Design a binder for this molecule. Structure first.
Ligand SMILES: [Zn+2]
Lengths: 183, 110, 90, 96, 101
RNA sequence: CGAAAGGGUCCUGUAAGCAGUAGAGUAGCCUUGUUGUUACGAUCUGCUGAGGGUAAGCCCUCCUUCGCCUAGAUUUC
């Protein structure tokens, strides 16, 4: 037996999975699932449906030009069986899988490089627009820290930043409404 | 170890409690399962829901109950004379950024 | 062997190598601002029911002094230095 | 769950576990066809009362592949490594 | 509007595929095969008025020139300009090739 | 044991927002056209197999949290 691939989405088709459409011109279409089969019957384009490997290859989100992807092919010329050849082939598939995975990770990082700069720019714009929503001391807290600093001869800024650290550590949420007292 | 007066914040997964329920009964059923959740959590048969919590449950119609809700349940002493139950729960809606990803947390008394 | 020689080559010119406190602070501040925006939106969605009925005007409802002092204290205004008790009616 | 022609080292439990059962961590029996019970149900296995008369009882079974994909849906992957190899790198992979 | 929209996905209500339409446009032998699978006496306009891109027969040249100005024909033209999905593109999506020696 | 949470497994199909010498064309200001420029503008592209859901009869978690417990009542050669 072997592993086929879905015509529509490219997922691996294992035995007894999906369905095959036999066309009168002589073409077989293997679908891994009824989702792909029904999209095919509705004549949807896999290149336009964004969840498909065809769309991802067309959009350039799959690593396609790479030396590790040239090892797997449909071999139409059979080779006489050789035990050492099959064992060294198995070792080759394992090493090729490791190399291909780590190259794919490098490819994805090269795709996703600019996110940090975009997020930093957006954060700077949001902070500059909404400086007034940053956490601050209460009026009673400022009064009590000022009187404690006056009593102890300490820095009001020091007590203010210590209380800011404490309030940043202790996060509390607010509840809607409130109980009405019975008479 | 735990005193009679204690408040905690919970996340109620109302989606699995309202799965498959008739559309005209989903919001009253959600109110009933909130009462049942509070009774099972705090041991009090007397459960009182905030009207803002009722508004939050009924916000999207009779069949638009949110999947998850963040509530605060407060067990308080019932000081009225001739009381069958000495404790009761009061359940409120909690203003949070997003109700997912939160744990059950004890609300500080101060 | 060609794949291997390419692999140590790519290691030689560093094809697989991997790479600020002010930046982290500004992302944390932006996240706090977004959380505050979400809380404000949730408050508005709680207090608005404009599909079925109109919101009562603010001038027709008299505000509690405790709520006003709590909101001004949260905003950072000393209520004792301005004396809201005299301004509050009875 | 590995055969002589399928060298993938894997156990009998499908991806995500058996639906409404869990995982099989003990010895298991593979039986051709269907059996009268349902999941979680106790079953009694018994020797046949008579000597068999069919060639099928004397046949030797040679398995080539055992399905271990998810039965919680249209599972197309036998192993989580196969699933990650097909999917590639995800957003949460860099976020972690 | 689609006639009998309830059962338009049935196999007996199936229409010609876009890759078959591309091969019909590229090769007249393929179009000849498809036309000999039909009877000329049952076709609209005796089979003399046929749009290959829509893969559909018409009663008259006036009707054919008429539908050419419509949006379904322009939709078919845009789909053919984009190119139909094939097994070669399906293999290229996953990086699969045929080794013939 | 229960309630959350996390991970997995499935389902859908790429979130809100921002940006763009992408965008048929139209209208303004001037270098009067040399992406002239600015504005609007279905849509497209990128951040983004992302967002959302996931047991209600899915799986795992002495090892991620919080809570509960050796009851009460009735009857019995
Ligand atoms: Zn498929």
């Amino acid at each position: 037996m072997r592993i086929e691939n879905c015509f529509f989405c490219g997922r691996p088709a294992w035995p007894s999975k999906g369905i095959t459409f036999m066309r009168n011109d002589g073409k077989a279409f293997r679908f891994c699932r009824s989702k792909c089969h029904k999209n095919f019957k509705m004549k949807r384009n896999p290149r336009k449906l964004k969840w498909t490997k065809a769309y991802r290859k067309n959009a350039g989100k799959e690593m396609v030009v790479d030396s590790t992807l040239q090892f797997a092919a449909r071999r139409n010329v059979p080779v006489r069986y050789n035990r050492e050849l099959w064992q060294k082939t198995l070792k080759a598939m394992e090493r090729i899988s490791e190399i291909r995975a780590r190259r794919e990770r490098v490819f994805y990082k090269k795709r996703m490089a600019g996110k940090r700069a975009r997020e930093v720019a957006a954060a700077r714009k949001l902070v500059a627009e909404n400086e007034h929503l940053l956490p601050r001391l209460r009026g009673s807290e400022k009064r009590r820290l000022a009187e404690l600093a006056a009593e102890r001869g300490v820095d009001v800024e020091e007590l203010e930043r210590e209380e800011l650290a404490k309030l940043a550590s202790k996060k509390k949420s607010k509840a809607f409404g409130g109980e009405v007292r019975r008479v | 170890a735990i005193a009679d007066v204690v408040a905690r914040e919970y996340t109620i997964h109302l989606h699995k409690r309202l799965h498959g329920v008739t559309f005209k009964k989903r919001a009253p059923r959600a109110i009933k399962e909130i009462k049942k959740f509070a009774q099972k959590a705090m041991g009090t048969s007397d459960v009182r829901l905030d009207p803002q919590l009722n508004k939050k449950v009924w916000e999207q119609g009779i069949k638009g109950v949110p999947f998850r809700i963040r509530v605060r349940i407060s067990r308080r002493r019932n000081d009225e004379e001739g009381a069958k139950e000495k404790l009761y729960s009061y359940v409120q809606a909690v203003n949070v950024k997003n109700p997912k990803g939160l744990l059950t947390s004890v609300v500080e008394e101060e | 062997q060609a794949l291997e020689e390419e692999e140590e080559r790519l290691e030689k010119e560093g094809f697989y190598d991997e790479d600020d406190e002010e930046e982290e602070e500004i992302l944390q501040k932006a996240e706090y601002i977004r959380e505050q925006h979400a809380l404000i939106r949730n408050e508005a969605k709680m207090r608005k029911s404009l599909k079925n009925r109109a919101i009562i005007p603010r001038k027709a409802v008299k505000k509690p002094l405790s709520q006003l002092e709590d909101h001004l204290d949260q905003l950072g205004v000393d209520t004792e230095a301005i004396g809201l008790r005299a301004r509050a009616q009875t | 769950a590995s055969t002589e022609t399928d060298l993938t080292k894997k156990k009998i439990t499908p991806m995500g576990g058996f639906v409404r059962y869990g995982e099989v961590n003990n010895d298991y029996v593979m039986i051709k066809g269907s059996v009268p019970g349902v999941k979680k149900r106790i079953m009694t296995l018994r020797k046949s009362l008579f000597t068999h008369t069919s060639r099928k009882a004397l046949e030797k079974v040679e398995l080539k592949w055992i399905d271990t994909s998810s039965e919680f849906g249209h599972g197309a992957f036998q192993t989580a490594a196969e699933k990650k190899q097909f999917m590639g790198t995800l957003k949460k992979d860099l976020q972690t | 509007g689609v006639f009998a929209k309830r059962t338009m996905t049935k196999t007996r209500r199936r229409l010609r595929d876009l890759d078959q339409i591309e091969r019909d446009l590229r090769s007249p032998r393929h179009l000849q095969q498809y036309k000999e699978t039909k009877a000329a006496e049952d076709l609209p306009g005796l089979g003399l008025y046929y749009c290959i891109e829509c893969a559909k027969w018409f009663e008259s040249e006036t009707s054919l020139v008429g539908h050419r100005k419509g949006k379904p024909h322009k939709r078919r033209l845009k789909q053919l300009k984009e190119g139909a999905y094939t097994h070669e593109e399906a293999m290229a999506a996953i990086g699969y090739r045929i080794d013939n020696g």
